[PDB]
Each structure stands twice: as C-alpha cells, then as structure tokens.
Amino acid sequence: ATKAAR
Amino acid sequence: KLSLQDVAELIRARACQRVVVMVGAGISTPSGIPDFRSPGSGLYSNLQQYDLPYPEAIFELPFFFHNPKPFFTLAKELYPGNYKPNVTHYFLRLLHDKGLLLRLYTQNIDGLERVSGIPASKLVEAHGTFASATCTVCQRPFPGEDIRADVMADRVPRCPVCTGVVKPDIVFFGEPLPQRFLLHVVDFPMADLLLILGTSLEVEPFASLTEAVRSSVPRLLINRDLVGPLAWHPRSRDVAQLGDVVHGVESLVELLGWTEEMRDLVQRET
Ligand SMILES: [Zn+2]
C-alpha cells in the first residue's frame, strides 16, 4: 500500500 | 501480434474509446526535468555536491527529518511554470480534447499535465501534490501556498503551532498514496486501452496498475525499454514502441493522422 522500489 | 499501426487503427475506428494512461519521470526529462532515479549533471549533481547523499533520499522520511533542505530546493525548482510541457504531454492533452481520455495516472509531481491543459478531474496525481502540506510533528494541514513564500525564499517552512517542519503532501517512500488513487478500482476495469509512457515501472504500488486492465485490453508501452510486468508477464495484446519517448509519441501521432492537430495545439499553447 506504501510507495516502494523493487 | 498487434503493431503500433494496429493500435492507431483501433483508435481511428473507435474500437478503443476509453483510454487510461500511466506515466512516469520519462515523459518529463525532455522538458529538462531530470529523473531522480536516473539523474544527470544538473539539479541532482549539484545537490549531491552540497548535502544530498543520494537522489532517492529527497523522498525518504528519515533523511528529511535529518535535513529537509535538499527536498525544498527541489520543491523550489518544480514551481509550476519553471518547466514547460513537451510533445508527450500535449499528446495526452489531445487525447483528452478528442474525448478518448478516461484517466491519466501520473507518478510525476511537476504539474506539467495540468500546465498542458488536462483538467484535474482527468488526472490522478498518484505520488502527491504541492497543493497542500502537513506538519511532520503535529500533523496539522496547511494550504500549499502558505509555505511557498518560505520555499521561494530558501527558508524551511515551519508550523505556526509547534514549529516543526511542514512537508508538502508529496508521497515519500514508505507513505500511502492519496485516496484519489483508488479511482483505479473502477477506471482500470473500464479502460479498453492502456498507454504506458516514460516510466521504469520500478515503483510500487503504481507499477502494478499495468495488471489491472482486462486481458482483452491492449497495453501500449512507449518507452526506451521493455520494463516491468510488460517484460516478465507479457499479454497477447501488448505492444511495445521502444526508443525515445518523444519519437515514439510522434510516430503514433502520425499514424493517427493527428499531426496537424498537434501542431495547432502546440503553437496555440506555446
Ligand atoms: Zn506542527
């Protein structure tokens, strides 16, 4: 649900 | 199976009428705005030689709590009107003017979609906005213009109640996206064509929207490279137009027969 980088 | 010409004919014949669009920093580097995950010798090179350890730290909360000044230098730089939209934006504007644009989902915070004339109701600015701000200490909200004078004056805006640093409602890593993002629940099943322009698809949860359209829906990627779920889990009706994003958009414009409209639109706007 939160902004993240792979 | 499908080509770029196929997609163009689907639009020309009104077989695709409800276009949803996903964009990232790749559509705004031709306007001179460097990509914070692929920077050059401009804004991010200078901040990294002053006090920024790496570019993604501008959008990380622990670093912000430690030194908010790099972020606010970027906020100052992104003041609307400092950069102008390029052909990619005006193509999206044209999609809207011709009644084809269901929604445009953007990961960018440069406001160039709005500057190009796309109405706010067609936009989902999924990574937040400078239009409002929140105190990082007490969580009081503030209109975005209440801190602009400070930012433009190279001052860190602080809360009038508790004096904590007031942060624009830009979505940092580790933060939820705005509730307007949940328009995708209805927008994406309703799209009959998905366009993906200038993005790495390496930032979630935005990237996973490429899987939210129906299997029947063509997914047209206009990007330097095949990326994300489009590369690992291709669908039968995917189309990739690989190379410079501007040249790819211009090729689609020509195949649509919109060259003259585009030229009219640009001169009237620029
Ligand atoms: Zn406060």
Author numbering:
A (entry chain B): 21 to 26
B (entry chain A): 122 to 391
What does the paper say about this structure?
Crystals of H3K23la(L)-SIRT3 and H4K16la(L)-SIRT3 complexes diffracted to 2.0 Å and 2.5 Å resolution, respectively. In both structures, F180, I230, I291, and V292 of SIRT3 formed a preconfigured hydrophobic cage that accommodated the hydrocarbon portion of the lactyl group. While in the SIRT3-H3K23la(L) structure, due to the crystallization conditions involving glycerol, two glycerol molecules’ hydroxyl groups replaced the water molecule’s position and contributed to the formation of the water bridge, resulting in a robust hydrogen bond system.
Lysine lactylation (Kla) is a novel histone post-translational modification discovered in late 2019. Emerging biological and structural evidence suggests that Sirtuins are not limited to erasing acetyl groups from lysine residues but can also remove other forms of acyl groups. Our findings indicate that SIRT3 exhibits higher delactylation activity compared to other human Sirtuins, especially on H4K16 site.
